[PDB]
Amino acid sequence: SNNEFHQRRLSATPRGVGVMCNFFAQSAENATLKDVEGNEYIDFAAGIAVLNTGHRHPDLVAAVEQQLQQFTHTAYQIVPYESYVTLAEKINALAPVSGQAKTAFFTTGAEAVENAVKIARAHTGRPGVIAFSGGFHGRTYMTMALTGKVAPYKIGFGPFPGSVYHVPYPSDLHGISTQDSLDAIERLFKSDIEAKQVAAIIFEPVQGEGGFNVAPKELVAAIRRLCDEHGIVMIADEVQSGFARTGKLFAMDHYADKPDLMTMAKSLAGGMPLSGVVGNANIMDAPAPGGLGGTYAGNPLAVAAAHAVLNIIDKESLCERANQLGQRLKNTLIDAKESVPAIAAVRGLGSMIAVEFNDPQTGEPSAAIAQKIQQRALAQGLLLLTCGAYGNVIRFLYPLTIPDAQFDAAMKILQDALSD
Amino acid sequence: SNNEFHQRRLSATPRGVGVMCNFFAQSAENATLKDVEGNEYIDFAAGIAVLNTGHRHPDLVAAVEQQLQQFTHTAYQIVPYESYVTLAEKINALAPVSGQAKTAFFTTGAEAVENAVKIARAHTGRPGVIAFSGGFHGRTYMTMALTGKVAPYKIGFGPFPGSVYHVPYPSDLHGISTQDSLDAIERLFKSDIEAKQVAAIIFEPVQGEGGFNVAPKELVAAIRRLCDEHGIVMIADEVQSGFARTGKLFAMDHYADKPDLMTMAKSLAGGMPLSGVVGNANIMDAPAPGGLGGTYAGNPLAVAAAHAVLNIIDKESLCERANQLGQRLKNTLIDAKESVPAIAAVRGLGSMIAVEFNDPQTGEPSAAIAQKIQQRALAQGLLLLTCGAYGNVIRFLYPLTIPDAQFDAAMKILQDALSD
Amino acid sequence: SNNEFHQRRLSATPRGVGVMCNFFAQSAENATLKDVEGNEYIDFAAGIAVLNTGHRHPDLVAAVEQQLQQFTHTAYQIVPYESYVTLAEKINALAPVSGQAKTAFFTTGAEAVENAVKIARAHTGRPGVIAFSGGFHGRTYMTMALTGKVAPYKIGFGPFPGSVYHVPYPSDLHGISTQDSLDAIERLFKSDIEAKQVAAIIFEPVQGEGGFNVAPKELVAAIRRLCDEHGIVMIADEVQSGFARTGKLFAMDHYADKPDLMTMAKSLAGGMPLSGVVGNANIMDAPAPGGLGGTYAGNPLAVAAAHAVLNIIDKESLCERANQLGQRLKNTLIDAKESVPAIAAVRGLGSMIAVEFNDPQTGEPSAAIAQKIQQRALAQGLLLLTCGAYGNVIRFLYPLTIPDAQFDAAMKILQDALSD
Amino acid sequence: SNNEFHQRRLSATPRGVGVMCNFFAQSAENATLKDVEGNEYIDFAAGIAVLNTGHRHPDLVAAVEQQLQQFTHTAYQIVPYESYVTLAEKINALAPVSGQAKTAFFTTGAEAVENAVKIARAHTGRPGVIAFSGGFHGRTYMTMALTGKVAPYKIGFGPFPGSVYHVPYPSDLHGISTQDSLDAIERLFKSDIEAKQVAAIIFEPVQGEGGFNVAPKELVAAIRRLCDEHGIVMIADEVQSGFARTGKLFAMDHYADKPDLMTMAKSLAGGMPLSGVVGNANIMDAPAPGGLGGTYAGNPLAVAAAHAVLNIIDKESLCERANQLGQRLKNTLIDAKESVPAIAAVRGLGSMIAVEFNDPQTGEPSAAIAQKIQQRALAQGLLLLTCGAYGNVIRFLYPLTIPDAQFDAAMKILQDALSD
């Protein structure tokens, strides 16, 4: 029963860990999710862009099973294992970072961001960090501070550390330009903190919870220029955009400038708990032995899954397929724009696409319309996710391995849900 | 080759992720670890107290495979699952908290400590946190601040947030008494922060990296009293001491006073990435919906493994067994105390036992002697771990499921390694 | 000799205490300063807007001597005196605060700002403070944090406290509007700190060292509105703009909205060390007995001088006079705007008037032209002061008591320095 | 009327500015204070150790009037003057700082400490500051954090900056030794902050508000040793102990080790608002020009007063007189220990002497007995001050210029007030 267990969950767990759906997952494969009462759903959430290679991809299951017949945990900081080194070598070969790449593995994306910040601070000896409004980087203390949304991520968890600031993110719909961001960064350097006291600038090439806003090329170039000038570490948070989501393996592959450090997680292990930081070896080697670590860091099962994820992305050509699916979804949303004026924007990159809804009679961002369209899709068996500053963005996070027929059915459902 | 991948590792990964052993893991079962060249080792590390049920316990592997046939990740905050709820119910039933309990799951122990601090700050509306010298609570920013050992955990990652203080932990060999701890707390209340601005007091009932120092009953009682008097949340970090290690399920079960919050990890899932926080349901309900979470939180495979772990500790009487094994180890160490004057102390609870070595001609802490015994034991096939402030303590973290014959062989090897 | 003592100065005092002039003061009266070698200077600095009533005003001197016959210091928090209370009563009656006013006295302007922040934190129980870029509020740690100009005030003195942020200040010449300020405040609320975690918003009605930028009426109204909505304390820093400088007694008297707190110093005692905070009695009474104080606070001689200063401002009609002299200066500057293309702006209120210079060919802010005009004037005997974000602003801080003929001589000198 | 003005004072000023006496000062000279109703009091407060040279010493009045006929304020950072340089040279010639000295002047002692910390931070590039429990250093934000007494100086003004810690001050009565302090410093280095991240260790040679505890020679030597070893700036806060109070010109003259920086105020100008920092020239020169300052800093009248105070201390042999008067008061207090069992301790240095009362029927610190003696002596026309962690200590801060007959009358009054 989904109601019995709804009450059991509300009684056993705190209200702080909120849950979107009131049905309980029973099984899942690729992009199909069945609950405990037999209802099937098309998963356009992918565990929040974690299942780019799909629920229980057979190669991932095979790799996890093979490793489960060897060992699940030795603590890498005690007894190492080759799979860690080989995955790090492959990431170094593929990651677009400055200089020669070195990679370390942790467990959660928040741990990856934390360690990127630790590496930057140890390299520069500086305290400051600049992030962007609307950015999301984790739910730990420091990663909350870096996160550019207060409600609900930061309510009641303050005070937050000093030397951490935010500048507005370029958004065409809201009149924020690249030059607005650069002016805010300059106002930081002239009012708040010395440029030679800022250790890192951290940014998402495509903001996840921010509404799938893409960083303009000028912005990435300017960030690279400022970091080169002032000795600041450039951090690209590719935790959500990484691994073929944006049409290339990493979102940063769409830009000429390379960041110094890059954080990875979610789809890195295709449904297993793994994260990592990859970047310039001169910067990564700043902490001494013992300065970085984590007990679950580089979990053998998750690392095997990540090897499988890389091979799947390659052999099934998930980058091109991400581009094709994103184009089809854009076509559907733009065609619907003619009949549903509430659609205010269609943005994104590759298969990282989102639609933002304004009230057609007011012009103000309306979360109500987004919620009701999300209700309609769900009742039709389509699981959609909400994001944005005002919670009026629907982001589409289908697995890149979703079959064509199921994707077309999902487009039909989305068309019927857009139009009342 | 155990030495070609050593160079590969040094070239691909950052220096900051330190590694103790020069060999690479190939397979592991219970307390037996086999490297890529075939060498066998008796694992007295258990992945740093993560494998209380031993490497790949058959029931844990069966549970993980069963779940692997259903789904590995749905993002719990999007789509929940019953295994999370039932595991929370079991932890609530077993946790040493006064009154109604509530449990939330995350992925890493540092994440659990972070959420305990978030819960305490949301409940009290205060900033301050008081921890203990020699304590270890994670490698994230806030958990580094709570950690009471600067070298090597905090070197280069400051500055650290305000309102976080440390008081000395009682140690009979170092002359620190419970009254010393309480006087330092009072000095904090009179010099650094008013008690009504302290949100939590976090402590390990048995210090992990601190040298297995056991908290006196008077200290736990004074902490409970100070917390009730000033409205401070009492946090017990049982990440390393939890799950049958100390002879009871949780170390706090050795004391009459119950904490408000308790953090769990490591052996909770017996080799899978899972952590948690259980406590006073009213305090746990302090953060509003949306304020707590984490993408991997309560990973389904790890949840299944944790169910298995609870059932294994029950059905195989691992508390009783930890008491027996700790007693055998203490007998071996005391029988050696007459031939080895370097044995300065033997401390701990249950099967969380450590031996501290001083120099037999100076009386000063001797880390070299401990490293030499460790060196000798590793050549005989026994993997031992060091800890303590001065690196002069050897901690015994054998899996609780180690067979009697292998344990007795390890005792013989240990007697030889102490022999000089 | 001015040289001998210049070298002795460099040898005995730190380089960090910067000194603008190469001559040493010997005598001073009203707006006339004589160096130790006999050279006379028309003082358009007034000790940085401290000598509004002019150097050694006879009434101030007579009051100071009369008190000197009584006592110079008793420590007010030990033994109080009636001059403190009567000055507090006069300030309470004259301050632009809604409802019952209370006034406390301290010694320096930074001390007044510090106590205003302390009062706001005690009244709200919140950590945060929001200030404006280009603002100056003192050289102590918290007041450096509030100051919105890094160079040179904050170089090497970090890190600075968390929960302290800055927003742009409206300027017609730099493209910053009131709505830009309000949007940045909203971005703070949405990205950095909860609105109901901000204790105060501190602002200058007329930015002193920032270039004499006048706060538009809409900005003050919006600040008042936000404070009423979020329960934030509205702090007006009138240390430099206060006491008849802007054509009315306080700059806030030009606006319909009233602040919760107002800080006073500089011309408060007309050349004696005294500061003060006046505001809402219910808010002022937030700190408990024993929370506010200062050994020198409300020094008797400075309090007598401040009594004299109020009586001088009233009897010699210094508000009206400030308006007249500001109009004469504006006539001179606007007249010169036809021959000097470098004159890009002439702004201010009353006798708080500044001219900003841009390059006549490029249009960029030209600090070199400003310096050039300052040296020309200095060579003719006119002591002028620089300010602005780029050091390209000349501020006119003559004593309001300056004789008309001396003012006209200074205007002629200024006209000569503006062209050739 | 003292009652009518008592009510007026409570009406016009905030409750936070606490006031000890309910009468209002009318006149004062040397050690005799007259209120508005004609009552005379022997001033054993000296405005909280500010009038070592006495109320309105004739030489100080003469210097102040001479300067008042010249100028009262020019803003030293705009136009300098001789008296600043000559006073700095005299301080450099007399101050016991390691190496050749430079001196800067400010206005309040809190500002002096603020600038000492600024100088240490600029010199070292480090954030950390270590202070002592029971120490008092100012009522500003940073000097609050440095202060080691929460009630009443810190209540409601948090949260406080990170990297600021406190260690116990050696006290014979409370069982705190030098080695306790050194162990707490080592615990800071091993649990809280790296030694190479601490910019300064600030301490009072004789704690003022803490109860006149004298720093033992071993403690000063250990602070000097640790500061030399780790690059930490050693700061002696002699705002209260300076200028012949302790029997030598500065308290540090009783010790063989020299601090790097020394802060001065209070008696520095003998009742006029002045403060200063004197220290090693190389360290003082750390902030770039424009980094240090203050509008009122180095007030000409106060600087003339400081010249006069130095001359008075020399010509009237105030150091020797401080020793003599301290010995006479100690004789009076020890002889009273026989009939007053409440006298638990009589401590101090020179004429910086305090008596600590415990309850003779339980052994508990008694602020009530101290206050009864205070009011008993006040009824007889003798004005005493309280202090201590528990408010149970009587301080004797008579002016050093007090005549012998008045001192003997005060001793008579003190003897009668000690007994019931």
Coordinates of C-alpha atoms in Angstrom, one line a residue, chain B residues 132-136 167-171 203-215 240-241 352 387 395:
Chain B
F132 CA 36.7 17.6 22.1
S133 CA 40.4 17.5 21.4
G134 CA 41.4 14.3 19.7
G135 CA 38.0 14.0 18.2
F136 CA 37.4 13.2 14.5
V167 CA 37.7 21.1 25.2
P168 CA 40.1 18.4 26.4
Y169 CA 39.0 14.8 26.4
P170 CA 39.7 12.7 29.5
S171 CA 42.8 10.5 29.3
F203 CA 31.5 13.8 21.3
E204 CA 32.5 10.2 20.6
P205 CA 31.8 7.8 23.4
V206 CA 35.0 6.1 22.2
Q207 CA 37.4 8.3 20.3
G208 CA 38.3 6.6 17.0
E209 CA 41.4 8.4 15.7
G210 CA 42.1 9.8 19.2
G211 CA 43.4 6.5 20.5
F212 CA 40.3 4.6 21.7
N213 CA 39.8 6.8 24.7
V214 CA 36.6 5.8 26.5
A215 CA 34.4 8.5 27.8
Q240 CA 33.1 4.3 14.4
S241 CA 31.8 3.0 17.7
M352 CA 37.2 -1.6 20.2
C387 CA 46.1 6.1 15.9
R395 CA 44.1 -0.1 17.4

